Every structure is written in structure tokens, then in C-alpha cells.
């Protein structure tokens, strides 16, 4: 089977820049390459067929070039909504095969998170478990640190977090961290605090609540 090698693995660029994706085939495939965009939680979207041919409904900023083994997808002036994984596909040789993808990330200015803390619901506490959630909204860059404290005891290992993909309009991330305790432990303590460190903040931000206030 033909192996397609896409480079780079991750491409990080600013809005308005020209960007190029490389796809290299293990042997010559003529111009029998097609390209796809796949946005977060989306289906692939055909951008270019047969190396350089346009597809109805695809913006003019997308174009393709190449012949033989070395192919290029170009976005001439990248827009925030172009964040996606990009894949090449060959079909000179059966079976049709796809590259492993290049992920396009967009740079933007530093933006501090807005931080919010949520106590566990009374409904959940009936179940015997307390989830405490700290939300870091619309920030950049992606790196951030959440530290949980319960009555000034540092919590370690009993939280999980996840981060959204970059927003298609503003290129920010958001992050949710969930601290999980038993009901019994939750009701034995008063001060629940999430401390957030981020490049955009001159000092760490703490959001806290007192249980029962």
C-alpha cells in the first residue's frame, strides 16, 4: 500500500499568514491526491481533488499543487475558522490510503481566563459524591495551572481536567477542572478554593466558596 507522510505534525500560524501543508507519497502517484479538512467533532470536508482542482463551495484561499510524490495544500491568508486537522488521500493505487494529518493551530494575543467556581449541587450530594468545578473561560495560550485547596490542604490526584479545542472565532481555549470528594468529606470542610495561574494574569486568581454560605 502507498504510505502518505504529512508534515509538519502541528502547524502553528497567525491570522492572515500564508500556510502550507506537505504530503509525501512513498512512490509516485501522479496527481491522484485529494485533500480534506476535519474540524473538531466534524466529518471530513473535501477541499481539493486531483492535486489542484477546485471543489464547489470551498473558499478561494484553499489551493493545491504538486505531482509525483510531493504535494502541497496552501491557504493563502489563514482565517480563525481554518483551525482543523488536514488530511491527504491518494488513489493512484488500490487501496486508497490517507495521511495521518497535520493539525493547524492559530496564534493570537495573550488573553487571561475568566474564572468561576461551582459548588456541588444538593442533588448530587444525595448520591454520596461531591463534584466541585472550576471553569477557566476564553484564554490564550493553552497552558494554565489549576490548584485546588480544601481548608488550605493542597489537593493532589483527585481532580481531572479537560480543555476545549480552539474557538473558531476568537482562537481561545477554555478549561474545566473537577475536584471529586465524598459527601462526608465535603460536609467536614468549609473553604473550597481554585487558584489559577496563567500568563495573562499578573498574579494567580483564586475563586472560592464557603460551604453553606
Amino acid at each position: 500500500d502507498i504510505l502518505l507522510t504529512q508534515s509538519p505534525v502541528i502547524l502553528s500560524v497567525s491570522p492572515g499568514e500564508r500556510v502550507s501543508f506537505s504530503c509525501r507519497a512513498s512512490q509516485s502517484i501522479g496527481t491522484n491526491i485529494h485533500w480534506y479538512q476535519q474540524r473538531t467533532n466534524g466529518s471530513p470536508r473535501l477541499l481539493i481533488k486531483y492535486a489542484d482542482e477546485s471543489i464547489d463551495g470551498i473558499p478561494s484561499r484553499f489551493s493545491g499543487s504538486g505531482s509525483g510524490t510531493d504535494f502541497t495544500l496552501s491557504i493563502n491568508s489563514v482565517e480563525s475558522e481554518d483551525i482543523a486537522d488536514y488530511y491527504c488521500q491518494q488513489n493512484n493505487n488500490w487501496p486508497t490510503t490517507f495521511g495521518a494529518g497535520t493539525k493547524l493551530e492559530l496564534k493570537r494575543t495573550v488573553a487571561a481566563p475568566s474564572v468561576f467556581i461551582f459548588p456541588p449541587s444538593d442533588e448530587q450530594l444525595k448520591s454520596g459524591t461531591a463534584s466541585v468545578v472550576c471553569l477557566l473561560n476564553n484564554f490564550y495560550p493553552r497552558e494554565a495551572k489549576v490548584q485546588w485547596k480544601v481548608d488550605n490542604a493542597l489537593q493532589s490526584g483527585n481532580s481531572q481536567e479537560s480543555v476545549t479545542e480552539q474557538d473558531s472565532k476568537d482562537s481561545t481555549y477554555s478549561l474545566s477542572s473537577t475536584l471529586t470528594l465524598s459527601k462526608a468529606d465535603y460536609e467536614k470542610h468549609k473553604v473550597y478554593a481554585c487558584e489559577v495561574t496563567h500568563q495573562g494574569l499578573s498574579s494567580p486568581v483564586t475563586k472560592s466558596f464557603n460551604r453553606g454560605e
Binding site: 485529494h34 480534506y36 466529518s43 471530513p44 470536508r45 473535501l46 481533488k49 486531483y50 471543489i55 488530511y87 488521500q89 488513489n91 487501496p95 486508497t96 490510503t97 490517507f98 495521511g99 495521518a100 494529518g101 475568566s114 468561576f116 461551582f118 459548588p119 456541588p120 449541587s121 442533588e123 448530587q124 448520591s127 463534584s131 468545578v133 471553569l135 473561560n137 481531572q160 481536567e161 479537560s162 480543555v163 476545549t164 477554555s174 474545566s176 473537577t178 471529586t180 466558596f209
Partner: protein, 217 residues
Amino acid sequence: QVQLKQSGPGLVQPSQSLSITCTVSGFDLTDYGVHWVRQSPGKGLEWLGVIWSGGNTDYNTPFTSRLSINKDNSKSQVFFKMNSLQSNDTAIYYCARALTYYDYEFAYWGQGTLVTVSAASTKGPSVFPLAPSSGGTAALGCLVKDYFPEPVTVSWNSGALTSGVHTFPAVLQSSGLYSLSSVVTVPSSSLGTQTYICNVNHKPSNTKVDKKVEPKS
């Protein structure tokens, strides 16, 4: 308009079979092949096979002895069946149609079917409110906890509220169940007038829950 709509996500037990239906519209199955492609978590695409206009099939080499594709032209349905699933067959499965009857440039795709291969039980989520508390903006949300397998869909106000929504990737907890949060930021002055409902659907367990979220008294 050309569309391909696939059956819902769900769990397959190891060594058992996967069955997916792709229902097409805006073209006739007698005029186009329908292809199947999967995508393993965090990976690229793998072409599995095709049922052509006239009913012939081709299967990619790894799948020739365990895949069958059939169709019903009169019902615009294509049936994908794969036997003997193992863990590493966990993937999003897609049906797809090419631009031209004989070709492989996939202009039209199904929405995908997430198939999880695991020995575990299907379990529906509990939904808890992330209540707003006291720059004019409030955040609120829903915690969708303790479900299996993925995925869950969350909308707000029956799809009418999309601005400011962030639905997070699920985390796998040490229990082997998923948990996810979905949040939205809204004007604080809307909290007394507007209702905020998160609509949660876990198709694998046929669990739909609408949860109202509001300031705690």
C-alpha cells in the same frame, strides 16, 4: 441535497459484531457507490470497502474475511456489518459518497457512528446543575456524570442557545465511566427572566434528560 445519515453510537462486546445502517437521500443508490471509512481515536482515516452502484463489493485487505456490505436500493439503505471486533476496532465509522459514480473523492460524508468495543455495561448519565452564583456576565452549566460508552450530546434551550457555549471533552474516571461538563456564559440580568435548560442525550442508553439550571435560593 445529498445526505447520508447513520445509525446511532453504541457499545459492541469483544468478539461480537458491529452493524451500522447508512440511509441516503438526494441521490439513488443505483447510481453511486457508497464507501465506508473509519477513524481510530486521535488517528487518520482508513478505507474499509465499498458497495458499488450495481451491488458489487470490494473490501480492503485487512477486512475481506470479516466485513460484509449489503444494501436495499428501494429503501436507500446501506448495511455495514463487521464481525469479531476487538478493542482496536473502537473508532468512528463513516459512510461516504464520491463526486462521481466510479471514483473515490469523498464529497459527502455521514455524521459518523462511534463504536466502542468493550466488555462493560452501557450506563446512562446523571445530570447535575452548575448553578450561577453572585462584568455583568454569569456562567452556568451542566455536569453530565457517570456514563458509558461515549458519546453524549449536549445542547442548550433546545438548540436556540449556542453563543458562549463550551461543551468539554469527556474525561474517563477511574471507575471506567465518563464525565463531561457543558457551560454557557449569559448576561446576569437574564437569570430572572430567561430559562436555561441543558438538553442531554446519551444515545447508547436511550437516555434523554433536560435539566434546568438556575441560581440557588
